[PDB]
Design a protein around this ligand. Structure first.
Ligand SMILES: Nc1ncnc2c1ncn2[C@@H]1O[C@H](COP(=O)(O)OP(=O)(O)OP(=O)(O)O)[C@@H](O)[C@H]1O
Ligand SMILES: Nc1ncnc2c1ncn2[C@@H]1O[C@H](COP(=O)(O)OP(=O)(O)OP(=O)(O)O)[C@@H](O)[C@H]1O
Ligand SMILES: [Mg+2]
Ligand SMILES: [Mg+2]
Lengths: 355, 351
């Protein structure tokens, strides 16, 4: 009956011994239970969860550094530290025999590609992707699940990740890990401590499955903004990698290669109707965008493009041409104008650098 | 029915009477009954947990010292505590149970020495971390009345180990939930009490279970967040950090070999010498624990492996001059303000 379905689910997987023992016990208990009862469907849902988890299924990982570097460099400009870390991860997974897992943390100012690089890394490694956002959450149940005794019990987001991704090689992104709750309603950072332990992660048990799951071959990537908020044992468990900002040159390269093309794709405009030269981009960056991230530059580019597109749909023009002389018309008054207050230093003044 | 389960045990009187009453109540009932299912599951659990059987724990001081020294390095007060445990278990002709607590900075080996202590004493090992746990159900269980009820973590541990006197390592005993939902600290205060271990009385089984032979170990990062009646029940043992020399011994004996195995390299492909390791520990890994030194070791071997695979080289050599482009900028500077002091300035050292 249903027991045959569960056995046929389990056949392809390579289950460990304790899991197979628990499954045998549960099938033996289900065999002698009347369908009209609620114990029956409690046990049936437990067997559902126990068999829907991929016990040995691993993704077919890409181990070609050429292809990995190509896919890694066709979606984000800089980030040499991150790209090198991923390439070394690949080289190690190849020099050893099998897949492996790590616990990384990307930290840096807002606007750099801390969140957007994870999906690219997943596509590069040909691993499965899953984004779990812990910003402000206080429910430890979202990490460890609830016991079976309760009515609407569920295993927790990590086990649901494994079930929904059908492999034990996912790239789990934990977004805004320094903004987690830590309140009267719960302190999920401690469960996160038990989850992201480089040595005990091999046997992590949530409270729904009383059996431990091997999360050692899972690529965990936490993204934080500041570090002093993360507690000391977490900071110890993770490998902090700094993703700094960008200088004007890198911002210009980003604008030319990704930001402006994507903004054009969104607004519908092409290079004929509205053209942004490299020189007006350099001027825009110099005069308006002096942050580490690129979100402000993205907003300024889309501002220029909306202003252009509004003249097209009405009768103001058929093509808009942006020059370093009429940039104030689009993005407004410049923000950064002059750097020196003294062109010739009098006897008593001296120019020093300051961070 | 299944009294052979008790034949392979030595059960006490009260649980025997409970099993007999429940077997009668099972006999006078019929199948297809909710009460039949409840009582059958109850007898299943009751006769599942072991009742008088112990593991034949090792009691050889030299063998235990060898197996304890093989795994870690220089946790001397912990190893002495375990050896004294064995000496007492020898002078008294029976098994023994204690309640220890290891507290110290992160990465010093508190959670890692427990499995080695279990290997030494030939006891069974259970971890059961409690970080962030909120509900008492995980310690004590639910009554038989509820559908889907089952005993707590301790009774499931007993059933799984199939023996009393296992070793239970309750992690993060200072990070237990004390918020709105539940307060399992009182359950732990009843469980880790040496005068009430002999009758534990979880909620599912109405019988009391003797837990006096279980060797409990609880790891904590700070004792401040442990309530005083609970600190007063544990033997607080401080696991302090390691100095540069102990860190070097750890790196040579454990860290670098394990990283070699995890990265697929050997000594001939990438050579980490004692002097470059000393320099790494001095300029980068200036902490109390070991995880950061392990991270640096993995970093060096990993960049080595990438250089080899990409075809750049076939054998990497990490020298105290070539270390910079492997681990980055040194977190601490070896050069001092004055290698030769002029008049007026004198070198003093502080704390
Ligand atoms: N080097 C880059 N190349 C191309 N696009 C980039 C680059 N850096 C950032 N971006 C783009 O800029 C935006 C950055 O957003 P992202 O979510 O990565 O920032 P974040 O660091 O996660 O911010 P927060 O601090 O809020 O988490 C994304 O749209 C991303 O596509
Ligand atoms: N003396 C030692 N010899 C060998 N390895 C050690 C030693 N001390 C620590 N380690 C290593 O440190 C790693 C992690 O240590 P562990 O996680 O047990 O520390 P911890 O006290 O649990 O930290 P936390 O308090 O943050 O949980 C282990 O893999 C262990 O091998
Ligand atoms: Mg983000
Ligand atoms: Mg620990």
């Amino acid at each position: 009956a249903i027991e045959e379905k569960f056995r046929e689910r389990l056949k392809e997987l390579v289950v460990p011994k304790h899991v197979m023992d628990v499954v045998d016990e549960e099938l033996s208990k289900l065999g002698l239970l009347d369908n009209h009862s609620s114990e029956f469907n409690v046990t049936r849902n437990y067997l559902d969860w126990l068999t829907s988890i991929p016990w040995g299924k691993y993704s077919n990982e890409n181990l070609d550094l050429a292809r990995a570097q190509a896919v890694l460099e066709e979606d984000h400009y800089g980030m040499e530290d991150v790209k090198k870390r991923i390439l070394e991860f690949i080289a190690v997974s190849q020099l050893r025999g099998s897949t492996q897992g790590k616990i990384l943390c990307f930290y840096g100012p807002p606007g750099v590609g801390k969140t957007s690089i994870a999906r690219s890394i997943a596509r590069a490694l040909n691993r499965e992707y899953f984004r779990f956002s812990v910003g402000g959450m206080t429910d430890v149940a979202e990490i460890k699940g609830h016991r079976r005794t309760y009515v609407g019990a569920m295993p927790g987001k990590i086990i649901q990740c494994l079930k929904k991704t059908k492999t034990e090689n996912p790239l789990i992104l934990i977004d805004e890990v320094d903004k987690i709750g830590r309140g009267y309603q719960g302190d999920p950072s401690s469960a996160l401590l038990e989850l992201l332990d480089p040595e005990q992660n091999a046997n992590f048990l949530d409270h729904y499955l009383d059996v431990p799951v091997d999360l050692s071959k899972v690529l965990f990537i936490c993204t934080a903004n500041v570090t002093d908020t993360i507690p000391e044992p977490l900071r110890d468990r993770m490998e902090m990698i700094n993703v700094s900002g960008y200088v004007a040159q890198e911002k210009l390269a980003i604008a030319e290669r990704y930001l402006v093309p994507q903004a054009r794709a969104l607004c519908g405009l092409d290079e004929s109707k509205a053209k942004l030269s490299s020189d007006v981009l350099t001027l825009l960056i110099k005069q308006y965008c002096r942050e580490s991230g690129v979100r402000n530059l993205q907003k300024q580019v889309e501002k220029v493009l909306r202003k252009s597109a509004y003249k097209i749909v009405s009768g103001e023009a058929e093509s808009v041409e942006v020059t370093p002389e009429n940039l104030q018309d689009f993005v407004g008054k410049p923000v950064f104008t002059v750097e020196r207050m003294y062109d010739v230093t009098p006897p008593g003044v001296v120019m020093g650098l300051a961070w």
